[PDB]
Every structure is written in structure tokens, then in C-alpha cells.
Amino acid sequence: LLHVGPTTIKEDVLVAGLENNVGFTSKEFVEALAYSLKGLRYVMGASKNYQPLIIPGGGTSAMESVTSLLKPNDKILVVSNGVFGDRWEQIFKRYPVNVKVLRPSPGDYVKPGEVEEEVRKSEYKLVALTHVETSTGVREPVKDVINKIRKYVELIVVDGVSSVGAEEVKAEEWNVDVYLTASQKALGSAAGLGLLLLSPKALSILDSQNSIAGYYLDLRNWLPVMRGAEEGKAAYFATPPVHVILQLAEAFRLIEKEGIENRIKRHTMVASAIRAGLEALGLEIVARRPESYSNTVTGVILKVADPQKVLAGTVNEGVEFAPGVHPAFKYFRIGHMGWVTPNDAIIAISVIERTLRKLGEPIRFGEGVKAVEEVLFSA
Amino acid sequence: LLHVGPTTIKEDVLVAGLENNVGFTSKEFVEALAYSLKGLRYVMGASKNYQPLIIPGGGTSAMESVTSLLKPNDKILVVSNGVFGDRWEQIFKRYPVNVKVLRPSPGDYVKPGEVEEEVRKSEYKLVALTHVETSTGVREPVKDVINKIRKYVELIVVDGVSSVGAEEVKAEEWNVDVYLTASQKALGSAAGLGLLLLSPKALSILDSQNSIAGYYLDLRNWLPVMRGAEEGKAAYFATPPVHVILQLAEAFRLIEKEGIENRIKRHTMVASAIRAGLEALGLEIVARRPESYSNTVTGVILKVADPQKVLAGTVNEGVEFAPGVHPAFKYFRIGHMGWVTPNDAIIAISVIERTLRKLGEPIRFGEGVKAVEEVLFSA
Amino acid sequence: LLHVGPTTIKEDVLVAGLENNVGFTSKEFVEALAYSLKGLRYVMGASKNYQPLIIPGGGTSAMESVTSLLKPNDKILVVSNGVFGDRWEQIFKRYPVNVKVLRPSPGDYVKPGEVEEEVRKSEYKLVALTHVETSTGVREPVKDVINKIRKYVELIVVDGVSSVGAEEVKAEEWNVDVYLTASQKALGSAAGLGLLLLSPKALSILDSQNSIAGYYLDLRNWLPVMRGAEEGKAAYFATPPVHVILQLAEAFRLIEKEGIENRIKRHTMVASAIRAGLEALGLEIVARRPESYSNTVTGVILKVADPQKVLAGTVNEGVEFAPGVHPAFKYFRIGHMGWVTPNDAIIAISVIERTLRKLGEPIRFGEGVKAVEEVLFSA
Amino acid sequence: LLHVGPTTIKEDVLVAGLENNVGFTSKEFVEALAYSLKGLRYVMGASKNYQPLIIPGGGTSAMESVTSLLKPNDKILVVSNGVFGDRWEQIFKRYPVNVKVLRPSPGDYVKPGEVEEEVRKSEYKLVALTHVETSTGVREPVKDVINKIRKYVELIVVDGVSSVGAEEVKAEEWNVDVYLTASQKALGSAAGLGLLLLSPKALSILDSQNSIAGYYLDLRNWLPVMRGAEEGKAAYFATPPVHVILQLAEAFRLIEKEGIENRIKRHTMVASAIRAGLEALGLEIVARRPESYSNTVTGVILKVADPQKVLAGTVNEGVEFAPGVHPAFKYFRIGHMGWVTPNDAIIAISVIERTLRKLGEPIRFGEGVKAVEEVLFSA
Ligand SMILES: Cc1ncc(COP(=O)(O)O)c(CNc2cccc(C(=O)O)c2)c1O
Ligand SMILES: Cc1ncc(COP(=O)(O)O)c(CNc2cccc(C(=O)O)c2)c1O
Ligand SMILES: Cc1ncc(COP(=O)(O)O)c(CNc2cccc(C(=O)O)c2)c1O
Ligand SMILES: Cc1ncc(COP(=O)(O)O)c(CNc2cccc(C(=O)O)c2)c1O
Ligand SMILES: [Ca+2]
Ligand SMILES: [Ca+2]
Ligand SMILES: [Ca+2]
Ligand SMILES: [Ca+2]
Ligand SMILES: [Ca+2]
Ligand SMILES: [Ca+2]
Ligand SMILES: [Ca+2]
Ligand SMILES: [Ca+2]
């Protein structure tokens, strides 16, 4: 069997979807969409000059919709740290475009200098980055990368599926052209939506040029719906996931009530506490470089125990554990994103200690939970 | 302003989505997906030889995913009775294919003989039909069309967004290659999913040939998820709308409990009652030919009153009314599909009588409600 | 079998109860209780000098809690128009008190003069009235009764279970000492609570005297909880139905948003429309005197059809029908209270027409629904 | 301020109450009541000869309803270990009965021999016990008490509000005449109901004798409702909390799915783990005698820190902490009952360690969490 840990959704978020006479023209729907659109500007750090869109699907449909900005034979550079970086390449194989991929050593990340070198050597229409690579837990220093490449490339896109709402994101200040995410990860809402924030530059391409996009994923077709909503008007392109968007509006209400800076600090603390627990047990982290330890995903190397058995025996344990699928390592991953609290840190390390002791993975029993406690106490 | 009436969702359906620890690998999700896949075979009248898929989006994403069955320069005949027939052509303009469209007089439908004539004259890879054309309330005699064209064309696709779960559908008996619908219409569940049933012939194309499809809407990419689910296995292509699918499973449970034959009879009675009400008021129906009066949508011609004012004054009135957007007629539309009951028939005609009397549309006040009562009594 | 029609609850009301970490000391609970307490002053027409209480149970526990105001051998006059008036007497048999009951002819009501005559003849500590007698649909002219008896009696209590939130109620202006109701009737919330509004006179009895009350239903024990809540403080006597009270707060929000005067007008219109439908069918109303036709309950006399069969064949019909249990009449009752709309009037009469036609009760088929339409149109 | 920790309710339990067209005559309600009645026999260990009742209110209304079994001047012995034992005496002061109370030293419990001595010296109609005394966390050895007193007393009643569903209960085997609980404690459902299980002997009293009971709390009045439900019949005495009972049925489904023996073991393990944590910190438990350490409540003595500050700083910390209200001790209490898991044990001790360290209560920081881990590993 396959077992990937699901991001826990606050009941308030889910319950916001229980309105049984709401459609895409309902004032309640239009208001939730307009609210979510502003919520997206807020979590991504951008002013009204940046255009938000919320489309059906997820991170993957959002990624593919970037073809809305491309023309035949356009040159694309993908900076891929693993599975989800590689998905850009799989998507672009379906399109008449030219793709080059940079990859680092397993579990590492592509340095800003290496990207800079490549964009000076060849002219690229588009550069794709992955803010956090979910398969390895590695955060790319996207700000540093962009500072170096901004003047050599027409467009920069960042996959923030595992970062937005949890890691610092400054789409406008960093001059990103498309920052995208999904509803079900670090935002902690129900699945079904892709979310995008476009620069004025990307928006001009939409408004004035043709593209290689299909029909459903051409952001041009969704623009009138998004623009209409902010003016309090209903418009129809294709039926969106109405109740999932009601749920998203409620997630954004909770996000705005906590405050994004506070949200980020919470993810830093929880992740730091979890990592301190892992280290005190003598467990090795998958991410090669400490400065890249993402605050949403941590890969945990096992020397003796079978990762698959760790996952099988922790299914009903109130944790978010998932398989490690990189040939270079034997590991499982801990998801720690969304509504995650200090108690989730304690639980994750406790569940880990007890499971690994049972399976004979050499660990310093007791030391993990104590180290977690220490971190949580000290801040 | 734009106001389209929303299909009322049974609360039980919505409430089935309130499970806050479910992801695409959860056995609860896998079971709901497998159940919904079987439910789709059931409402469409097909055996295990036909392959169901449930994908993110809606009717439009389902329609576009038909490109999964096409090759460059393939010849397509679209039989379009209005807006949603025309959407096939709009979708196919994004693809390297050759499209011819047959259209009838406004509010009429393309006769089976006219389609037969065209497919004998020229060779077509694909013929696209719309079972019920939502913009006009016209039901295409799809069975009759197919009987005549089956031996002259490789593939037949039917858009059943406004028919499946309400009109008779026999995908297997009629030998349709793709029968498709959405979650939010005559099935009466929450929005966010497209649904497809493929013949063995269409499935062989998927399994053995390349196509002009993009990435997200290539049915090949969803097949392992659908096949896995029916064997009780989780598989990942892209995150689906997990909770919308939980809701869909519950809608299919209610559909199977009523029985599809009974469901169809209910839609026939409610629609017949509503139409009898309209006629007794002296109101003219948009559909030109009575044999094509769909049992999910009825267009109502106004001679004096402004359709927009009818819609504005019936917003909180517990009905499903929508604008008429065909230049050839001045009208509004009544949606009567999903969980619709005899009481909905009475309400719709009563709300119509009272609104039109207020606005001076010449009608036989009182006679509508009486005629509805008569029909509901006699069945 | 027994079949009593349930008051339909807005989903928003129910959904307000889905908070899974709320207890009697939670700020959310205290706020909902304080809100509901004010909501009770509002629907009953009283200033802050009147003391609201919300206790576990229903109308019956509220009625019994009136013993909190009594002493051994106190004299009580019950003005009983049927079953629920008679319940006062059944309750008081359990207590060392002296009870006299006035009853009118079946389906009539006790005139104000008849009560006045009795309270001048003997001295009574307490007079009990029923605002609307649910078993017959008869509204007592409580204002007129009180105007006549106020100076001759120490305490006046009014059972408003079937009136509060639907009929005009002015507890303060009319000088009532206890006005009581339940959560599940004309207020349209979930069952589980009795609700009481006490005059300063009744409150002084609580604060300064002993009583014959038991433990759970001694309003003295609940007072500190109610007083605490309005000061934003939690207090414990016995655990209340926490989530039912969350639901009640939401019902009061909806009531206050509509406005009580508007609520009353809606009940008048719906009831008048239903009665006009009944009359046009040639059906006789149970209430003997038109000025007493309650706007929450209407008894419908059948000359031929069996009331029990009317009820059996209308169970899934979206109506609120209940048995007639008074030996003097052959009838069923229509409940029309709470969130009831003009559409409910149309439905009730339509369901009645179709059911009675099937069962051979002589009626003027078609005429009922037309008369309802006319009433709803004319206001 | 007063802050008592709320028992966390599984969302599934709450969500079972979202049926908006259900009343006391609905077959859905009757089925939920019948199911809950059987569920009550199951959790209390009794065959069909024992009669369950579910009444509005809570533990307190259930306790008072025991007056249904009493006659004027009946002699009662209350075995009270604290607040909730003392509530028997407070209730009985409202009734013409003779009460004697046995009390132990603070935080201790009345030995079976001490009760035996008293019932042999004087003749008692009724002996009242508290299975777990919530105010001190002390479990009375009710089986041992009953074995000694059974032949000397007519009736034995046990308050199991904090024991039923968590501690071993054998109502039939131990020959208890009334075993009672509430919906919101160790059963973990929504508040609003009292629950009783009566012996054949107590039932004969109901069926054949008069009593000193009031009206609402006379178990005679509820019996036809309970008997009717198990024969699949609706009956009316007073409106029950319909949706709270739907929720209760769902709680009983979850209890029966786990199995009562397993439920008991879970409470033993979680409580043992929590206590091991407390001891390893050097914290003293309020219960004087280890054999009486209840598995639902533990009192924690503080030597230096203010209990009130512990409560104030742990409000949003996902725990169930409550004040200690016995003058003889300075303490707070930990609730660990219902759906409580091993993770709740870890969290409670961690939250305690971190809070007390902050407030300078002398503890062995780190040692609590380790001891909890050890216990959870070894079971
Ligand atoms: C960085 C990143 N980019 C793109 C996607 C694709 O999103 P959708 O699935 O919404 O199309 C993701 C999604 N991440 C994802 C999805 C499913 C499983 C796991 C796992 O942890 O094993 C991770 C992701 O984490
Ligand atoms: C026959 C038909 N085909 C395709 C679609 C597209 O479905 P999605 O929107 O789920 O992609 C539809 C949708 N039907 C539809 C959708 C929105 C509004 C109205 C209206 O009545 O104006 C009708 C439809 O009715
Ligand atoms: C006027 C009146 N007074 C007291 C009560 C008792 O309330 P509780 O049940 O909440 O204790 C009521 C309740 N009314 C009631 C209850 C059950 C059935 C029916 C029916 O219409 O057949 C009516 C009532 O309508
Ligand atoms: C043993 C026991 N007996 C009777 C009751 C009364 O139950 P109701 O409240 O449902 O009538 C209880 C209630 N237990 C209870 C209730 C409220 C607060 C606290 C606290 O921890 O301070 C404890 C109890 O714990
Ligand atoms: Ca909440
Ligand atoms: Ca239901
Ligand atoms: Ca035919
Ligand atoms: Ca015409
Ligand atoms: Ca709402
Ligand atoms: Ca569940
Ligand atoms: Ca023993
Ligand atoms: Ca001590």
C-alpha cells in the first residue's frame, strides 16, 4: 500500500463549505472568491498591482497554466531539486518548448551562482524554481537566485506549493512573475484549487499576446472571473469548485487573524523543535545543507529500520508521515505545515521514538522528546 | 448583473465532506472513489468493460480531456444546438485538429438524418453531441443519431452534463465512446469534478497510442489512479478534490437507493408538470420541437416583461432560474434537475405566476398552478 | 404509528453546534448564552429589568420550574383550552398546591370576562394561561385577560411555547410574571431547552423566599449561571446542553436580523394564506372563533377521509402535519411556525389538495392553491 | 475566572446531529434512541432484564430522578467522597426523606467495612455511591462495597458520571439498582442527557408504587417513551433533546466498534502513563490511596505555583485541566476520559512540565515526558 500523510484541516474550514444553495453567481460565492483573491496577495506579499487567480485542480494545474505565458520554441530553464522540480519538465514535454534542467547532488540544492552562470550563457524566456522540494524537504534560496538572474531572464516562476503560508514569501519585493501554490498544503484548506499570483509583466503577456495554452488552463479564460469577483460581479467561464472556494475563504480568514509573520514564526519553531528532536535521537536529516532545512518537510534517514514499516505502524497516530522516494536515501518524511502547533512537534517525535524503539532503529530513547520540550520552552 | 440558479444539494451530500483527516491515500478516500466510479457505470448504463474516470474541474475539463483520444489533423464533427455544443469548437481551436460544426435553426436540434448525411459524405474520426443543450433546454435524440452514424465514424462523444442522472442514458447499449458529465448538475453533488465513461475502443486508444493532450487533462495520467482505486489501492498523479469526491460518493449512494429508472421518472413527471403549468398560462417554450423538451431545463419566452426583472425579483424565492442567452429569443430558463420534487414544480409555477402578474406579462393567472396539480395528481 | 411534524431547522442553526472543544466555561459558550438571554428579552418585548433564564429540557421543564415561585397550599387558577393547558394541572398534582381549572367548549377559548369573574370570586396566588393551544390551534387573548385580572392576582404565567417568535408578545407592557417557551417550536432551533422571562416581582420571590421546587428545576439554582453569563463569567450549577445553546444563539442571530415585527408579519401572512386555501376547499377549521385562529397551528376538520391516512400519506412531503387529539373533532393539524415562508403555504395546501382528492374527501380541487396564491400576491 | 476543561468530542459524533428534519416521531430518532438504550446496557454490563432510560439534563437530573423510587420518610445513606457525593445530600434536602452521609478524610474514600458497619446498625431504603469522585479523582471500590452491603439494603444507586465508558462497570453482576451517567463525560458525546439503568427490582417500584418525584423527573413518565422506542414506536411525554440523542447514538456506535474492554484498557494505560509522568516530576497526587487513583481524573498538588496560574497559561494548549476545589489541598485536576489517546498523555505531561518550569514549581524537568514514553512503549 501507499500512505501519504494528509494535512489536518481545521473543522471551521471544512464547515464553511456547508451552504447548500450557493452557486457561482451567489453573492456569498463572489464575496468568498474576492476575499480569497485578496488573501492570496496577503500571504504572498504583494500589492494590488499583482493579479491573483484561483483555478480548479491543484499545484499541478497551476504549474501547467504557466504555458499561458509561452510561445512556440520559447526557452525554459528548470531548476530542479527533485520530484516536483522534475514535474515542470514532464509538463513542458507536452508543449512545443525548449527545456533545460539543472539538478544538484541528491538532497542538495542548485546554488544561485550555478543558475546565474546558466542564464548568462543562454537566453531564457522562463526560469522555474521550486521554493520547497517536497520529496527531500529542501528549501531553495529563491530570493538569492532571483537577485542574481532577474536581469537576464524575461520570466521567473516559483512553485510554492510547500512554502506559501509557512515560509517567508515576498512575490513583489523579489520580483517574481508567477508565484503559485495549491489549497491543500501549507495553506491548510480543502483540496481542489490551484492558486497563482502574476506580476504586471506576466499580466501584460496575457492581455496582449497569444499562447500555446489549451482551453481550461489558459489563464486568459479565468481572468474575467477573477477581475469580476473583485468588483463584486459574477462571471462565467467554467464552473469552479464553489464550496472548496468557500472553505478557502475561511482558511484565509484564519490566516489573516493569526497574521502571516506569526504563521511563519510558528512553522519555524515547530520545525526547529522537530529537527532538534531528530538530532538528539541521532537521526540524520535528508537535506544536505542546514541553511536549506525547509520548515514544512523533513526527511528522516533510517540506518536499520524499514521506512515502509515506520509508515505502516504510525497510520492512526495523528501524525503527517509520508514515504521517501529518492533512490539515494533510505528515509521517510515528516510533514509539518498548515495549522501545525507545538503539540504536533511533541507528538511527532514521541511517535517516532516509540515506533523506532519497537523496530530496533538505534536511537537515544527519551532524548528526542526532551530536546523538543527544550526548544518549545526556550521560545 | 448575472444570476444563474444553483442546483440545490441535499445536506447529506455536503455533510459527507466533513472528514478532516482524509487525503488521497486514506482508505476512506479510495473507497469513495471506487464507489463513485461504479456509481458512474450505473447512472450511465454500462458494464465493467467500460472504464470510468473522475477528474478535477467540471464538464469543461471533461470535454477537453477528449483530446486524449485525438492525433494531429484528426477530423471532428460537432453537432451543436447552442452554447455548450459551441464550446466543443472553442476547445478544439486550441488543438491541431479539423473541426466542422452542424447547427440547426435557433432552439431546434440537428436531425439524425442531417448528421448521417454528413458522416457518409466525409470521413470523421470523432462526432461530438450534446445530450441536453442547457442554453435552450433542447434534448438531442442521441440514440437515434448514433444508430444512424455508428458505422461511419471511429469515435462518438456525448456531453451529458445536463442529462446524466435525469434523462435515459445507455452508454453501452448505444455504443458511445465517451459519455461525460459533471458533479454539480443532474447528479446534484458539489462542484469540482468532471466524469467520463470510456468504451473499450476509447480505452485501447489510451493504452496503445500517443495524443495531442496536455498534461493535466491527459486521461492516461488519471487511469492508474482510477484502476488503483477499484483494486483498493492509492496511487498519485495529481491531488484530486478529495472532499468533493467524498460528497460525490454520497450522492451516488442516494442515486442508487432511489434507483436510476425511478430518478428518470421523477424528472419526467416534474418537467411535464412544469411544462403543463407554462402552457396553461399561455407561455411559449423556447425549444421549437416538443419531442426535444428536456426534462432538466425549460426556456420560457416573455412577450412583454423583461427576463432580467423576472430573475431579479425571484432571487430569494427557492427556485432555480437562469438567464436566456440566445439572441433569437427573449426568455429566462427554469432548471429542474437533481433532487427536484413535485413541490419544486408547484413552487416554480407559483413564483412565475406571481412575478409575471406583478410585471404585466399577459398570463392566465391561477391556471398554471391548477395544471401542475393535475399532472402531479395523475402520476 | 404516531407521526408529529417536526419544525424545520435552518442548516445554519444546526451547523452552529459543530464546535468540538467547547464546554460551559468556554468564552464561546458564555457569549452564546449571554446572546441568547438578550435574544429572549427581545422576542418577548422586555427591558433589562426582566430576567431571562435558559434551562435544560423544554416547555415542560420550564412550566414545572414555575413551582420555584410557589409555597405549600398556594392557590392556582389554570385557564386551559386543551392538552397543553391541562398539562399545568398534571404538573401541579405533583405539588402541595390548590388548583382550579377553567375550560371552554371544545375548540373555543375562555373569555377574559370568565377569568375576571373567577379571580374576583377567589384569591389566587398564580394564574396560568396558554398563549396558543397547540392541540386545537386556538390563540388566547392573553393581553385582554391580563388587563382584566392583573389587580386581583399575585402572579401571572403564560405558556408561549407555540407563540413566542411568531405571535405578538409583550411580556413587560402586558405585565406578565413568567413568560415561557421552548427552543424547538416558533423559535425554530434545536430541542433541549426551556426558556423563561421573569418580572421583577417574580425575581424578588426567587431572591427572598423559599419554595416547593425540587433541585434541578429550582430557578434559584440557575440564576447565578444566567447572571454570570451576562457579566461574561462562567458559573456552574449543572451542565447545560452546551451545543444546543450554541445553536440557539444562532437562531436568535437570524431572528434579530429579520426583526421580530417582520417575523410576526410573516407568520400572519403564511397562516392567513393557508387558512384562505382551506376555506376555498370547503374545509372547516377546528378553532371555533376566528379572532382566535393562531398563526402557528391550524386544525383541519375532515368529514369523510381518515386523518390518520392523511398523515401516513404526507410523511415525505416536506410539510409539518400532526394528529388531532380532541374527541370532539375529527381532524389533523398543520404546523406553520419558525422559518416558514410563502412557499410553505403553497406546498401545504397543494399536498392537502392532492392527498384529499386521492382519499375522496369532498373538496374543490384546484381552488385551494389559487386562493393561497391570491393572498400571497395581495401582500 | 472559572475554567473547566471540556471533554473533546469526536467530530463524527457532532456531525451525526446535522439532520434538519428530524423530530421525536421520526424513524431516524426512534432508531437512535433504541440504539442508545442498547448501548447503555452494553457499557454498563447488563442483559435485557435491566431497563435503560435516557432523559433530558445530565448527571444531576439523573440523580434527582432517583426520587422516583422513594416514599415519604425513606431512609437514605449517602457515601460521599466529595463534591458530587455531597450533591446527593443537596438534592435530597428538597424531598421528605431522611439522609445520613458518611465522609472519609479529605481525598480518601469510605472503606467497604465502614459502609457495612452502618447498614447493619440501621435499616436503609437506599444507599448512594459515587464511582469516581470528580472533585478529587478518587475511585470508590463500588464492587467491594456492594458485596458487603447488598443483603442489608433495599436499593443501591451508583453515580457513574465519571466512570461509565472508562472504568469497569458491571451493573447486573454487582446487583446495582440504579447505575447512572451523563452524555458528556467518559462517554464523550454532546451535553444534554442523563442516562440510567434500572434493575428489575427498581423497575417493579416504578410499575407498582407511588413516589415523591415531581413531574419531569418521574421516571414513570419517561418509561413509555423508552419501551416504545425499543419496539420501534414513537411516544410522547415531553420533547427530548432530539439531536443530542442522534449524537449519542453515534458515540455508542464508536464505543461498540472499539469494544468496552478495549476502551477500559485504553483509559488504564493513558491514566497510568499520566500518573507515571507526575510521579517522575516529583508531583504529589491528590487521591490519598493508590488503589483509588481513578482512570478519568487526577488531582495534582502544587507546593509553590498557584493552580489558577497553571490553568490560565494552559487554556489554548489542547488539554483538559480544571480547578481543584477542596479546601484541604492546593491543586488542579487533569481530565483524561472519553476518546483520550496516548498522545493526550504525552501532551498533558509536556504542557505541565513547561508551565511549571515557567512558574518555578520544583520539578525534575524532562523526567515526566520520559516516564510517560516508557509506559506507552511498554503497553
Ligand atoms: C512542491 C509541490 N509542487 C507541486 C505539487 C503538485 O500539487 P497537486 O498534487 O496539488 O497537483 C506538490 C504536491 N505535493 C504532494 C502531493 C501528493 C503527495 C505528496 C507527498 O508528500 O508524498 C506531495 C508539491 O508539493
Ligand atoms: C451541457 C453542458 N456542457 C458543458 C458544461 C460546462 O460544465 P462546467 O461549467 O462544469 O465546465 C455545462 C455547464 N452548465 C452551466 C454552467 C454554468 C452556468 C450555466 C447556465 O445556466 O448559464 C450552465 C453544460 O450545461
Ligand atoms: C403550548 C405548549 N406547551 C407546552 C409544550 C411542552 O413542550 P416540551 O415538549 O418542549 O416539553 C408544548 C409542546 N408541543 C408539542 C410537543 C410534541 C408534539 C406536539 C404536537 O403538535 O402533537 C406538540 C406546547 O406546544
Ligand atoms: C461524578 C459526577 N456526578 C454528577 C455530576 C453532575 O453532572 P451534570 O453536570 O451533567 O448534572 C458530575 C458532573 N461533573 C462535572 C461537571 C461540571 C464541572 C466539573 C468540574 O470538573 O468542575 C465536573 C459528576 O462528575
Ligand atoms: Ca470554531
Ligand atoms: Ca440524513
Ligand atoms: Ca427513436
Ligand atoms: Ca414565438
Ligand atoms: Ca448560511
Ligand atoms: Ca469519520
Ligand atoms: Ca475487590
Ligand atoms: Ca502532601
Q: Which atom of ligand 1 is nearest to the CA of A62?
A: 11
User: Which residue of D318, D341, D373 is in closest CB contact with A369?
Assistant: D373
* Technique used by the depositors: X-ray
Residue of D nearest to B20 (CA): D11
Euclidean distance between CA atoms A376 and A355, whole angstroms: 23
Chain length of chain C:
379
The number of CA neighbours under 13 Å toward the Cβ of B187 is 34
Residues in chain D: 379
Q: Closest ligand to D21 CA?
A: 6
> Gaps in chain D (C–N > 2.5 Å) come after which residues?
none
B109 sits in which H/E element: none
Q: Is residue A129 within 8 Å of residue A163, measured between CB atoms?
A: no
Dihedrals phi, psi of B350, to nearest 5 degrees: -60, -50
Contact assessment for residue D370 and residue D40, using Cβ atoms and an 8 Å cutoff: no
Nearest-angstrom CA–CA distance, B36 and A144: 47
Q: Is the CB of A59 under 6 A from ligand 1?
A: yes
Indicate which of B346, B349, B353 best probes the interface with C, i.e. most C CBs within 10 Å of its own CB.
Answer: B346
Vertex C334 angle, CA C333 and C336, to 5°: 145
Q: B239 in ligand 1 pocket by Cβ < 6 Å? A: yes
Q: Is A325 on the interface with C (CB under 8 A)?
A: no
Alpha-carbon distances, residue B245 vs A331, B166, B224 (angstroms): 31, 20, 17
Q: Nearest-CA neighbor of C153 among C124, C191, C196?
A: C124
Cα of A58 to ligand 1 centre, how many Å? 9
Contact B191 A22 (CB under 8 A): no
- State the distance between the two ends of chain A, measured CA to CA, in whole angstroms: 39
CB contact under 8 A, A61 and B184: no
Q: What number of CA atoms fall less than 13 Å from residue B64's CA on the CB side?
A: 25
Residue identified by cell 497526587 is D285
D243 touches chain C (CB under 8 A): yes
Give me the torsion for CA of C208, C210, C213, C216, rounded to 10°: 60
Q: What are the DSSP E strand ranges found in B150-302?
A: 153-159, 178-182, 193-198, 284-285, 297-301
Q: What percent of the residues of chain B are helix, what percent strand, and what percent coil, each to the nearest 5?
A: 45, 15, 40
**E-assigned strands of D61-159?**
75-79, 98-102, 124-130, 132-133, 138-139, 153-159
Strands A75-79 and A132-133 come out as: unpaired
Among residues D195, D213, D202, D152, the alpha carbon closest in space to that of D176 is found at D202
Pairing status of strand C138-139 against strand C192-198: unpaired
Identify which of B132, B198, B135 has the alpha carbon closest to the alpha carbon of residue B165.
B132
CA gap D145, D142 in Å, rounded: 5
Q: Ligand 2, residues B54, B134, B193: which to mutate, most atoms within 8 A of Cβ?
A: B134
Residues of C in contact with B370 (CB under 8 A): 366, 369-370
Phi, psi of A334, deg, nearest 5: -110, 120
**Mutation choice for D interface testing from A343, A354, A359 by most D CBs within 10 A:** A343
Strand B51-56 relative to strand B98-102, pairing = unpaired
**Of the candidates B251, B20, C17, the residue with the CA atom closest to the CA atom of residue A14:** B20
Is the minimum CB–CB distance between D203 and chain A shorter than 8 Å? no
Give D318's contacts in chain A (Cβ within 8 Å). Answer: 341, 343
Q: Which residue numbers of A belong to the known binding site for pyridoxal 5'-phosphate?
A: 59-60, 134, 162, 184, 236, 239
Rounded to the nearest whole angstrom, what is the distance from the C-alpha of residue B247 to the centroid of ligand 10? 13
Residue closest to C126 by CA, chosen among C46, C40, C54, C65: C65
Describe the crossing of helices D242-258 and C242-258 by its angle, rounded to 10 degrees.
140
C209 assigned ligand-binding residue: no
Q: Do C57 and D57 touch (CB under 8 A)?
A: yes
Name the closest-CA residue to atom 5, ligand 3: C59
Which domains are present in chain D?
A: 1-259 (3.40.640.10), 260-379 (3.90.1150.10)
The finding on whether A312 has its CB within 6 A of some atom of ligand 2 is no
Residues 19-38 of B with CB under 8 A from D: 19-20
Expressed in angstroms and rounded, the spacing between residue B22 Cα and the centre of ligand 1 is 15
- With a CB cutoff of 8 Å and minimum separation 6, the contacts of A142 are A129, A131, A158, A174, A176
* Residue of A320, A321, A346 best to disrupt the D interface, most CBs of D under 10 A: A346
- Residue in chain B closest to C369 (alpha carbons) equals B369
Burial call D96-129: b when 16+ CB within 10 Å, e when fewer: ebebebbebeebebbbbeebbebbeeeebbbbbb
Cα A103 to the center of its chain, rounded Å: 19
Q: Which of B11, B19, B20 sits opposite D18 (nearest CB)?
A: B11
Please report all neighbours of A, defined by 3+ CB atom pairs within 8 A.
B, C, D
Residue B322 in contact with ligand 2 by CB distance below 6 A: yes
Distance CA D96, CA D112 (A): 28
Give the residue from B57, B239, B246, B215 showing the smallest Cα distance to A184: B239
D198 strand-pairing partners: D51, D178
CA of A211: how far to CAs of A96, A220, C83, D199, in Å? 11, 10, 76, 80
Resolution (A): 2.0
Q: What cell numbers appear for C374 in the block?
A: 391570491
Known binder of ligand: residue B162?
A: yes
Using a 10 angstrom Cβ sphere, with 0-12 exposed, 13-18 middle and 19 or more buried, the burial of residue C327 is: exposed
Q: Which residues contact C157 (CB under 8 A, 6 or more apart)?
A: C66, C126, C127, C128, C129, C176, C177, C178, C179, C180
In the beta sheet, which residues pair with residue D55? D194
D284 labeled binding residue: yes
- CB of C134 within 6 A of ligand 3: the answer is yes
- Pocket residue to mutate for ligand 4, from C239, C243, C244, most atoms within 8 A of Cβ: C239
> Which residues, in sequence order, are bridge partners of residue B175?
none
Atom of ligand 3 at shortest distance to CA of C59?
7
